[PDB]
Amino acid sequence: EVQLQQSGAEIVRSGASVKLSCAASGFNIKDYYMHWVKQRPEQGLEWIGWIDPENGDIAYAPKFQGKATMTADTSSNTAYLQLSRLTSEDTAVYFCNGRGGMITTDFFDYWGQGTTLTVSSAKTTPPSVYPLAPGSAAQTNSMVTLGCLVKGYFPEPVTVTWNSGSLSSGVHTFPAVLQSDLYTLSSSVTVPSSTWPSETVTCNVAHPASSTKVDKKIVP
Amino acid sequence: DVLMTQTPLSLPVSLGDQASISCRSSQSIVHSNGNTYLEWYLQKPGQSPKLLIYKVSNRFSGVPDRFSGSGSGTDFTLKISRVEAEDLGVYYCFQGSHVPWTFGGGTKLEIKRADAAPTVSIFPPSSEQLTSGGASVVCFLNNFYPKDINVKWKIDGSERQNGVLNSWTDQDSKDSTYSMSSTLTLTKDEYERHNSYTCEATHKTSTSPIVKSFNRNE
């Protein structure tokens, strides 16, 4: 229950600025030093800076001097990270970490859940959803694998279900990748070959940013 | 910046076994004040890092005694005795002695299981996609172990390497397998120019590639 709660995902254009927040509940940030950390899948974890919220002392990693501005508001028990002059290399998940509450030798260490920042000038775009069925010269085994291709959407995420949730085992949905400044993913489902195409299989794709829901029937 | 390097990159282990992960700094991370601020974190998929060890060898609250940290100067180790399922994830070392503080690149602790060959399925572009002038050919390589795999696309028997995008699942929490998708994206004109499309998977489970193919004219 006691936690640091970070603000929600942000999509922002290059050259803009954003201010991320991290709010404590169950403890007083005056009793903690706060740290911000950046994470990307390929470049990994990077330390951004440190702040003492009580008196405003601050220190930044060299690479974030001018990029990052850390502040805190003890009255609202919140720490903030502002990022300026945004570019694609700022697209990351940002974590806050509080360390403190030390009376003698014991201490508390809390992490926020992370805030995703996406820096892009792409427009909100619903996915095109396409059925994936095996070739017409493909002999059904014991099991058959079907799929759905979800192409050209922005921003993340989409959700994919099969038969409106009734088909849950044997399902994989792969992570999205960028293709032409939009996202693409596929989902696969495996069912007994006796059950398809005699019983129907449908993928259900939802894209909340565009309020889009689409159902695509998989046919031979 | 002081560079933190971890080995191995990936450590397959069976539950109950021991694991040891090394962390080396490019120079000493003893702080002016005599302390060595070497920390270890575990990060599980979708979660934040969680502190395991601080100042080289001190277990954070709630961290079981099967985790132990050691080392000095530029060379450090995290040892996990009797690995449990809850220990699986990515381990990072971290130095907070010299600004900028830096993280290691991570070591993935992963569960072993029996070798498993991928199930390979190839999917021609849907009629719907051909309508709009695109053509994506999809190959699924499902439920294989170990994670090391190579995928090759061939168009009329010749390898194609541009316009291919791959995506991997995390190790499955139920059966400990991996899965992969490979998508070849062509113009409709390029697609209609050739007849044979093949996805070939090379996995340690056989010297022979698994080949799945279709012909556009069928």
Partner: peptide, 16 residues
């Protein structure tokens, strides 16, 4: 007396 950043936990007074 400049104040550097630290990995030490912040200290708090006793809670009676």
């Amino acid at each position: 007396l400049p104040t550097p950043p630290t990995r030490e936990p912040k200290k708090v007074a006793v809670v009676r």
